[PDB]
Amino acid sequence: SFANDATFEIKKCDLHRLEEGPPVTTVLTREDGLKYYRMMQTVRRMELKADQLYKQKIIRGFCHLCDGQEACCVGLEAGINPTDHLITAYRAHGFTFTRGLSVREILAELTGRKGGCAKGKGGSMHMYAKNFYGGNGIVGAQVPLGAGIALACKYNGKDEVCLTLYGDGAANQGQIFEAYNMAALWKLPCIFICENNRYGMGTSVERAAASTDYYKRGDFIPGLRVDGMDILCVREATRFAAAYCRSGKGPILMELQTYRYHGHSMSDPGVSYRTREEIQEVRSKSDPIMLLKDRMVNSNLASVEELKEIDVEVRKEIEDAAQFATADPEPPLEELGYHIYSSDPPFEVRGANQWIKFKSVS
Amino acid sequence: SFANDATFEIKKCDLHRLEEGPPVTTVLTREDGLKYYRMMQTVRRMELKADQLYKQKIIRGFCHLCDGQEACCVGLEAGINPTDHLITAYRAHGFTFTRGLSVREILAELTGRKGGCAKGKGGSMHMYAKNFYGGNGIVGAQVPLGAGIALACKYNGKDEVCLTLYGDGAANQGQIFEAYNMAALWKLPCIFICENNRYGMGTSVERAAASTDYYKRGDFIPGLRVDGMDILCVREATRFAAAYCRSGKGPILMELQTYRYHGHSMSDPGVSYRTREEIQEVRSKSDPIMLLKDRMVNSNLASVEELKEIDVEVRKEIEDAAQFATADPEPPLEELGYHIYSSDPPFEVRGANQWIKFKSVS
Amino acid sequence: SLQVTVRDAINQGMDEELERDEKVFLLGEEVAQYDGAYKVSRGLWKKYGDKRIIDTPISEMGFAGIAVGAAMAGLRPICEFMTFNFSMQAIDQVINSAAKTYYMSGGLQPVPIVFRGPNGASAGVAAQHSQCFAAWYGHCPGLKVVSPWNSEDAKGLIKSAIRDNNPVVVLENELMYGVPFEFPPEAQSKDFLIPIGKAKIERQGTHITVVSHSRPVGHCLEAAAVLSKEGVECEVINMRTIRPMDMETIEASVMKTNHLVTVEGGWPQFGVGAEICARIMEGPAFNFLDAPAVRVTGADVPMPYAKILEDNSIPQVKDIIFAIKKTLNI
Amino acid sequence: SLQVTVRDAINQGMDEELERDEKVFLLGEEVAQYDGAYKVSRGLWKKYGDKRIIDTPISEMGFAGIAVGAAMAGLRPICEFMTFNFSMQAIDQVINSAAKTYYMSGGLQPVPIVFRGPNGASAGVAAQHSQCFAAWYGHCPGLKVVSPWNSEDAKGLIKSAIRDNNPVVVLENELMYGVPFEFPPEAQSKDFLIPIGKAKIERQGTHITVVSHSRPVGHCLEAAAVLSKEGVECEVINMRTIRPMDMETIEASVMKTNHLVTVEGGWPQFGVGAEICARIMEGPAFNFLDAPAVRVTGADVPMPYAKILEDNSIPQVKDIIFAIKKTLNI
Ligand SMILES: Cc1ncc(C[n+]2csc(CCOP(=O)(O)OP(=O)(O)O)c2C)c(N)n1
Ligand SMILES: Cc1ncc(C[n+]2csc(CCOP(=O)(O)OP(=O)(O)O)c2C)c(N)n1
Ligand SMILES: [K+]
Ligand SMILES: [K+]
Ligand SMILES: [Mg+2]
Ligand SMILES: [Mg+2]
């Protein structure tokens, strides 16, 4: 009945200081397709749910959604090992899930309850997981950190690599350039990834960068530009970049051309610097979930009915997770001073006045 | 009866993203040759004297000598107008002189006397003058400042340009890259100059930079590599860079290949990372002053006797300055708090304890 | 005479100074076409264009240094940090390039620049976006630091900041931006100026002196209203300037009330409250004290996300009242 | 017996920790082949190699961030800043990426890293190279800040810092590097550790408590010797730790002497002395104070270059003795 695997054509990557790039043809098994589809769908529904909870004021402060960029987190995960490392900025709900955290833990952290992955201490921007280092709020700060994690990989000789992600807006931060230099100087297994969604908050790439060829900003470091809406292209480029780094050749730059459907954050309607027609055009022409779906249905890797059933299962998983995140209690006030220092005996911490004391345990 | 002027051939500059570079031939008049000679000679003797005063404990703290880089400061000045702007790092005794400050003022500031260009408040690393903004101790900090001065030049529309110098060591500072992006984005009349003297303190360029082609690090910004030992090469490239910026074409990167005979600073012998023979070889074959000398005599622009006469006057001048600086009284303690704020009415400033009060006047 | 928010008072101040001097210009992230990250610079770009209102890439250290360089060359820049948490990347330019320059040059190089933007705690922004920098900046010589509370403070201080010929740090508050205040005709004038270095008594009192700056000033006033019904009269002082602070007004008040309480939103150790208490103990007001001065501040932990945790990490009216009753022993 | 300089003590500590744990490594400008900008890491590269002792290009923000990353990944980096004046370019990595991570992550991500280097005034280095950052770092929760004076301090504190599992800032002093002190057999041991958070009484006294940290501690002992010949006995306390400071020890001393004087080399406003005076005022020892506490600090101006001016910008023994006589009215 169903094909067990199918070959597809993927866009050729633009190269910088590379003789040859990833292959322009790849094989997708039915088993992998089903996994990728379910994963992207979960990320998609989780973000639409976060949006709803935010409007209801269940979620506070910052809340950056990644819908439209699902091919990036799922495609990246598909190209690396669970033992590999990854770090990114604040738009990391998708990455937290692909790296192993349940939808429940994630939504519970967004709603600031005790059951959150951080127990309501960090919120939307600061989530950690196995070999996932955030989830960082200061633009560009995560790049030198990723180089540091890559240094540790080399130092311990484990043959693992580190994926360091940053946006187009962050590509103009000076520390990113100090990082390129050191990574190349010490040949660190660092994969520098620029997620280019065309806008730095409200500023388009052309108004913020003198040069919009992000994959070549590394100069002496080789790079490649990839189609960030095609899960298969991302997976292929990632497998290529990872193998490049594991062979000891040093760092490499990867530019993912993608797009975000929502504004910069929940407080930005995202229409003062771009039109509604543009957003819908990208959606109808290249929604990553739609593209994978059409591929699998056409190649008979899966039926339109099976994919529909998966959607139903995902929607229920999301709903049950949201129920848990809105019913779960807040962290008790008595643990406010907890985890200031690691491996230290208990001590007291001052509150709003000298008569208010909070216990602090590691 | 000497030639009024002569034509000389200069080495072609390496170019990065430039259709054409500076001319390969230039005309040197007798009046200019004699002038540049005296200038480079003055700077050379002034630094050797500073060195001597340091060993005698007359000068404290930092004291970086530009000994051997005379063709750069004199050559740069020869290529710009007095209304143009310049800013560099801490090794700028020569630049302060070429920008208009007397040797007396410079040495008096080094010996911390009231006769110093800063009343003894700044020292070796902080000296200002007309359109000369220091004299900056934080490596790399002067590049964004230079871009700001360039911004002001564009804003005022007087056709002035700004020369911003930084060492090869400073070339790996992140802020320099942030400055490149903005200068290109806004087409600022900024000439970024990298004085490549092969060493960032004790670290050779090959150990600190993945790429040692500094005139190209700007990536999207055009650049050129210049022989920083030939004053006529520097003057010609400088005149070219300035015209490029005045024409409204934006920033340009200029790399001057030079060398420093002394160590990084007075506290560094500068022989643990390089051999004495290397220093001697460069001095023997490419000393900036000897190169100009042999050029003027051979072309009958001047006589060896006349140059020897200039050397005697220069030595005399430096000796008088050194006498002044060593005999000039220290600044009065009553002015310790002066000039903290500009255009403000006087006020009290606290000393070592609450009972010690210093007056502060703008 | 009319209602105007802090956001609109600051916008008014900048607008008037931009019209008054062509050397003044604004630069920062999203300050132009986006109308400002918090809409404070709204309408400015549309009125003055690309030359005066400049959007910049996300390069803090970079554009801060550029602003300082433009100031050394004679221009009078207003450099906006989206939040001061981000000013840490550019703090070297503020301290080592802007603040010490006039002194280092022996009075030859002045630096007329203004650094402004929201400072301190907001709402649910977590640890990396809730830090108060009043104490850090107020610690450096050659710098002037102001922290306005209401609309009148905001407009008067920003204009004075722009006119001063030295670097001035204006620590605003995001939570105060949308709060409306009664704007008298004197504040509506384009000549309205509030001098840097002078405190203000927002409420006269005889029982105790309560000193604060920025948003918490509002909490002190509410605290004063509640205690008032109990027969306790608080003298609420709005610092306005962090450096150079007006200790004379504070001491004069203490000589009358014999009791002192400071309220701030930042971390307690080495904070603003500590400096006030030390100044009090070193000055002539120490002997007028009938009880030790007490400090109300934010909790000594990085800002937690959870609502109930965040509320207990920032001083509340009840914390202020509790500290006052302790000092008065009632 | 054995007499060792502070520089040698620090070198011994690092060397012993490097041998003890292969995950410990040193990085910074000129730390390897150059043997150290101030020779503190002399011989380390020769013995351990390019992997354990890494020379870095001049990229503060960069390698500090690289260091934090390596620590998060399980390594124990010792990040050296040539001087702390240069740490401003990377202070964001120290505060937002290192100090707050354990808390924000809910206790999942520790950051065992050490930041060390000379702090404060030197000899003729001018304004941009003489700033003291004790007050700045000690203000931040999640960080530990220590400031050693003599050889014992240096060795014990660097070893404790390296073994701690949280970010530790070690503020050293360049003028102290070459100063020799007697090194007891105990300090000679590879097991010598000084607990972070405990002050040490360098001199027993009954008439007044003098608290200080770093280089000025030597000045206080100098002042104490001069005063004893006059009949005044000072109790000198070496803080050792800025955060969390040992206030308990200071209070026990004040409750005996009834007088307090703080001495520091940094700027007065919002400085270390201010926090101590605020703590004493809010603490149990306040009722034991017979005279207000006074602060001795560096002048409130950026560091001048001229010798005579610099001599009066830093606290001298005469200023300490003066302050002490004023407090004791003698
Ligand atoms: C150092 C710093 N400066 C400014 C900000 C404010 N800020 C938060 S997100 C953002 C936009 C970053 O855009 P981009 O890197 O392109 O990523 P995207 O949100 O599009 O994924 C800005 C300027 C910050 N977080 N950190
Ligand atoms: C931000 C900063 N980091 C480190 C230093 C210490 N430092 C002073 S000079 C120097 C060497 C700079 O070398 P280079 O830029 O090549 O200039 P040169 O002295 O050779 O002209 C270093 C590392 C500093 N002053 N500022
Ligand atoms: K100003
Ligand atoms: K540590
Ligand atoms: Mg973007
Ligand atoms: Mg050099």
SS (H, E, C) chain B: CCCCEEEEECCCCEEECCCCCCCCEEEEEHHHHHHHHHHHHHHHHHHHHHHHHHHCCCCCCCCCCCCCCHHHHHHHHHHCCCCCEEECCCCCHHHHHHCCCCHHHHHHHHCCCCCCCCCCCCCCCCCCECCECCCCCCCCCHHHHHHHHHHHHHHHCCCCCEEEEEECCHHHCHHHHHHHHHHHHCCCCEEEEEEECCEECCEEHHHHCCCCCHHHCCCCCCEEEEECCCHHHHHHHHHHHHHHHHCCCCCEEEEEECCCCCCCCCCCCCCCCCCHHHHHHHHHHHCHHHHHHHHHHHCCCCCHHHHHHHHHHHHHHHHHHHHHHHHCCCCCHHHCCCCCCCCCCCEEEECCECCCEEEECC
CA separation for the pair D35, D11 (Å, rounded): 11
Among candidate residues B256, B192, B231, B242, the one with its CA nearest the CA of residue B84: B242
Q: How many contacts (CB atoms, under 8 Å) link B and D?
A: 143
DSSP label at A43? H
For chain A, state the CA radius of gyration: 21
**List of chain B residues whose C-beta atoms are within 8 Å of the C-beta of residue C104:** 118, 121-122, 126
Among candidate residues C268, C222, C250, the one with its CA nearest the CA of residue A353: C268
DSSP label at A286? H
Tokens 């189609």 -> residue: A227
**Ligand 1 mutation pick, A139, A173, A175, max ligand atoms within 8 A of CB:** A139
- At C53, which helix (H) or strand (E)? strand C53-55
CA separation for the pair C62, B179 (Å, rounded): 6
The answer to whether D327 touches D294, Cβ cutoff 8 Å, is: yes
Of the ligands numbered here, which is closest to the C-alpha atom of B170? Answer: 2
- At A196, which helix (H) or strand (E)? strand A190-196
Measure CB to CB from residue B182 to each of C51, C59, C97 and give the nearest one: C59
- At A145, which helix (H) or strand (E)? helix A142-155
The answer to whether C104 touches B125, Cβ cutoff 8 Å, is: no
List the alpha helices (DSSP H) in chain C.
6-20, 44-48, 60-72, 91-92, 101-104, 134-138, 151-163, 185-188, 216-229, 247-257, 272-282, 307-311, 317-328
Q: Please count the CA atoms within 13 angstroms of the CA of B178 that sit on its side-chain side.
A: 32
Give the Å distance between the CA of A144 and the centre of ligand 3.
34
Measure CB to CB from residue B172 to each of D58, D127, D315 and give the nearest one: D58
Which of A155, A160, A358, A359 is the mutation pick for testing D, counting most D CBs within 10 A? A155
Q: Are residues C184 and C219 in the same domain?
A: no
Q: Which atom of ligand 1 is nearest to the CA of A168?
A: 16
Residue in chain A closest to B173 (alpha carbons) equals A178
The answer to whether D170 touches D113, Cβ cutoff 8 Å, is: no
The answer to whether B170 touches B177, Cβ cutoff 8 Å, is: no
Q: Are residues C186 and C203 in the same domain?
A: no
Of the ligands numbered here, which is closest to the C-alpha atom of D97? Answer: 1
CA separation for the pair C71, C98 (Å, rounded): 9
- Residue environment code for D209-233, b if the CB has 16+ CB neighbours within 10 A, otherwise e: bbbbbbbbbbbbbbbbeebeeeebe
List the alpha helices (DSSP H) in A173-253.
174-185, 205-208, 231-246
Task: Answer yes or no: do D270 and C272 touch at CB < 8 A.
Answer: yes
The answer to whether A326 touches A312, Cβ cutoff 8 Å, is: no
Please state the φ and ψ torsions of residue A228, each to the nearest 5 degrees: -75, 5
CA separation for the pair D119, D170 (Å, rounded): 9
The partner residues of A204 in beta bridges, in order of sequence, read A199
The answer to whether B330 touches D307, Cβ cutoff 8 Å, is: yes
Q: Are residues C106 and C76 in the same domain?
A: yes
Of C195, C213, C244, which residue is a domain's last? C195
Q: Are residues D233 and D205 in the same domain?
A: yes
- Residue environment code for A222-239, b if the CB has 16+ CB neighbours within 10 A, otherwise e: bbbbbbbbbbbbbbbbbb
Sign of CA dihedral B95, B100, B106, B112: negative
User: What number of residues does chain B have?
Assistant: 362
Q: Are residues D201 and D314 in the same domain?
A: yes
Measure CB to CB from residue D63 to each of A174, A182, A362 and give the nearest one: A182
Partner C, chain A 210-269, Cβ-Cβ below 8 Å: none
Which of C103, C162, C251 is the mutation pick for testing B, counting most B CBs within 10 A? C103
- What's the helix, strand, coil split of chain A in %, to 5? 40, 15, 45
Resolution to 1 decimal, in Å? 2.0
B136 — contact with chain C (CB < 8 Å)? Answer: yes
Q: Are residues C178 and C34 in the same domain?
A: yes
CA separation for the pair D120, D297 (Å, rounded): 12
Residues of B in CB contact (< 8 Å) with A are 172-178, 180-181, 184-185, 208-211, 216-217, 219-221
Task: Answer yes or no: do C126 and D142 touch at CB < 8 A.
Answer: no
Among candidate residues C103, D125, D119, the one with its CA nearest the CA of residue B112: D125
Neighbours of B333 (CB within 10 A): 12
Counting the structural domains of chain D, the total is 2
The finding on whether B297 has its CB within 6 A of some atom of ligand 2 is: no
The finding on whether B201 has its CB within 6 A of some atom of ligand 2 is: yes
- At A34, which helix (H) or strand (E)? helix A30-55
Residue D244: cis peptide before it, omega within 30 degrees of 0: yes
Q: Whose CA is nearest to atom 17 of ligand 2?
A: B167
Strands D180-182 and D168-172: unpaired
Question: Angle at which helices B304-327 and B103-110 pack, to 10 degrees?
Answer: 40
The answer to whether D42 touches D14, Cβ cutoff 8 Å, is: no
CATH number of C294's domain:
3.40.50.920
CA dihedral A6, A11, A17, A19 (to 10 degrees): 50
CA separation for the pair A344, D296 (Å, rounded): 34
Give the Å distance between the CA of A69 and the centre of ligand 5.
11
Q: Are residues C27 and C169 in the same domain?
A: yes
CA separation for the pair D204, B3 (Å, rounded): 84
Specify whether C60 is catalytic: yes
| End-to-end Cα separation, chain C, in angstroms | 40
Q: Are residues C257 and C123 in the same domain?
A: no
Among candidate residues D154, D171, D179, D205, the one with its CA nearest the CA of residue D83: D171
Q: Which amino acid is at D248?
A: E
Q: What's the token pair of residue B170? A: 């400073």
Point out the annotated binding site of D for K(+). 113, 161-162, 164, 166
Of C179, C195, C211, which residue is a domain's last? C195
Among candidate residues C309, C305, C313, C311, the one with its CA nearest the CA of residue C129: C305
**List of chain C residues whose C-beta atoms are within 8 Å of the C-beta of residue A140:** 58
Point out the annotated binding site of C for K(+). 113, 161-162, 164, 166
Q: Are residues C9 and C152 in the same domain?
A: yes
Specify whether D60 is catalytic: yes
- The contacts found for D191-194 with CB under 8 angstroms, 24 or more apart, are D192/D155, D192/D156, D192/D159, D193/D156, D193/D159, D193/D160, D193/D163, D194/D152, D194/D153, D194/D156, D194/D157, D194/D159, D194/D160, D194/D240
Among candidate residues A308, A297, A215, the one with its CA nearest the CA of residue A8: A297
Residue in chain B closest to A178 (alpha carbons) equals B174
Task: Answer yes or no: do C57 and B181 touch at CB < 8 A.
Answer: yes
CA separation for the pair C24, C39 (Å, rounded): 19
Q: Are residues D212 and D317 in the same domain?
A: yes
Please state the φ and ψ torsions of residue B244, each to the nearest 5 degrees: -60, -45
Tokens 């006033």 -> residue: C221
Q: Please count the CA atoms within 13 angstroms of the CA of A149 that sit on its side-chain side.
A: 27
CA separation for the pair A104, A325 (Å, rounded): 7
Distances (CA, A) of A312 to A38, A53, A323: 10, 20, 17
Q: Whose CA is nearest to atom 2 of ligand 2?
A: B139
Task: Answer yes or no: do C142 and B340 touch at CB < 8 A.
Answer: yes
DSSP label at C46? H
Domain that holds residue D119: 3-195
**List of chain B residues whose C-beta atoms are within 8 Å of the C-beta of residue D301:** 336-337, 340, 349, 358
**List of chain B residues whose C-beta atoms are within 8 Å of the C-beta of residue D46:** none
Per domain, the residue ranges of chain A are 1-362
Name, in order, each residue with C-beta under 8 angstroms of C184's C-beta and a sequence gap of 6 or more.
Answer: C1, C152
Distance of CA D138 to the CA centre of its chain: 10
Residue in chain A closest to D143 (alpha carbons) equals A341
Residues of C in CB contact (< 8 Å) with B are 25, 51, 56-57, 59, 61-75, 92-93, 96-97, 102-110, 112, 141-142, 144, 164-166, 244, 282
Helices (H) and strands (E) in chain C, counts: 13, 14
Of the ligands numbered here, which is closest to the C-alpha atom of D79? Answer: 4
Q: Are residues D168 and D219 in the same domain?
A: no
Task: Answer yes or no: do C274 and D269 touch at CB < 8 A.
Answer: no
Among candidate residues D172, D125, D127, the one with its CA nearest the CA of residue D146: D172
Task: Answer yes or no: do B172 and A184 touch at CB < 8 A.
Answer: no
CA separation for the pair A334, C47 (Å, rounded): 53
Q: How many contacts (CB atoms, under 8 Å) link A and D?
A: 138
B329 — contact with chain D (CB < 8 Å)? Answer: no
Q: Are residues D167 and D225 in the same domain?
A: no
Q: Which of C29, C60, C251, C264 is catalytic?
A: C60
Give the Å distance between the CA of D308 and the centre of ligand 4.
40
DSSP label at A215? G
CA separation for the pair D93, D74 (Å, rounded): 17
**List of chain A residues whose C-beta atoms are within 8 Å of the C-beta of residue D167:** none
Name, in order, each residue with C-beta under 8 angstroms of D201's C-beta and a sequence gap of 6 or more.
Answer: D235, D236, D237, D238, D249, D253
**List of chain D residues whose C-beta atoms are within 8 Å of the C-beta of residue C166:** none
Task: Answer yes or no: do A174 and B172 touch at CB < 8 A.
Answer: no
Of D168, D195, D222, which residue is a domain's last? D195
**List of chain A residues whose C-beta atoms are within 8 Å of the C-beta of residue B211:** 184, 219-220
Give the Å distance between the CA of B78 and the centre of ligand 1.
44
CA separation for the pair B161, D28 (Å, rounded): 36
Distances (CA, A) of C329 to C326, D159, D281, D284: 5, 47, 16, 16
Name, in order, each residue with C-beta under 8 angstroms of D287's C-beta and a sequence gap of 6 or more.
Answer: none
The finding on whether D125 has its CB within 6 A of some atom of ligand 2 is: no
Among candidate residues A309, A346, A357, A338, the one with its CA nearest the CA of residue A118: A338
The answer to whether D103 touches A337, Cβ cutoff 8 Å, is: no
- At A54, which helix (H) or strand (E)? helix A30-55
The finding on whether B262 has its CB within 6 A of some atom of ligand 2 is: no
Looking at 3.40.47.10, 3.40.50.1240, 3.40.50.970, 2.30.30.700, the CATH number of the domain B1-362 comes to 3.40.50.970
